[PDB]
Design a protein around this ligand. Sequence first.
Ligand code: V7Q
Ligand code: CA
Ligand code: CA
Ligand code: ZN
Length: 268
Amino acid sequence: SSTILIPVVVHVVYNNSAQNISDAQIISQIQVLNEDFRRMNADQANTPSAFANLAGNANIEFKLARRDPNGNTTNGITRTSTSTETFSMEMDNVKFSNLGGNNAWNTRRYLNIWVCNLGDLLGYAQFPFEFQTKPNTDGVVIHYKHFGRDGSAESPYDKGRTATHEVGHWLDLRHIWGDDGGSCSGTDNIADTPNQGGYNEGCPSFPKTDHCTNTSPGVMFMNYMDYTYDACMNLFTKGQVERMRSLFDTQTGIRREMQIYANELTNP
Ligand SMILES: NCc1cccc2nsnc12
Ligand SMILES: [Ca+2]
Ligand SMILES: [Ca+2]
Ligand SMILES: [Zn+2]
């Protein structure tokens, strides 16, 4: 497979000094996305051998924009002082300059990552099916305490995996347990993710079983699309990789336009 290139702009929207996170912290997150989406994450050593053969390399590269929407030079990082103290998922106010946030850069050409103070919410995504109706709010929001790996990020969500999970949703992946409140009925529509009752939290011991997969090697609680601690997640499946890449299909791909100028938007 050929590398899919994603131009990124990180909108730091800060009401105080703590929210105005460091360049190092932002570069740390860009690096984590590149590791997790190219299976160059060192904690792939924690992937059980039973699931190692299902492990996907998405071969998606994330580069900070070097050309802004007016065609001027940028480092792909915006900093917006805000009078708003906590942002709302329901309002999407972080995504509008008009409401004390920062307007999206053309969502057909850039992945917009908003960093801000959110309401015990780690972050939220918008799914591709919503793009036609909600073009301005396409992208990913991350809580400033859970952006980037180590540094200023707070345990136990301190390895940058909130953004990996949210970019997952942004590329059309569903919760591995099927958003069915614990049943075996719901599906993530991925053949190589074992059927799973409910979400996992914390760091379960391998193997974790439930009424849906009651046998070793159990459910893939170390999948990025579960709700487990950052240090206890370490793969996408080949099935998940195919779903994500299909959005960039040159004929039918919802996000295909992103590839046309990706190189020019990320090259000096
Ligand atoms: N572990 C990934 C993740 C992303 C977003 C919200 C979450 N709640 S708990 N785990 C989450
Ligand atoms: Ca599945
Ligand atoms: Ca389920
Ligand atoms: Zn989720």
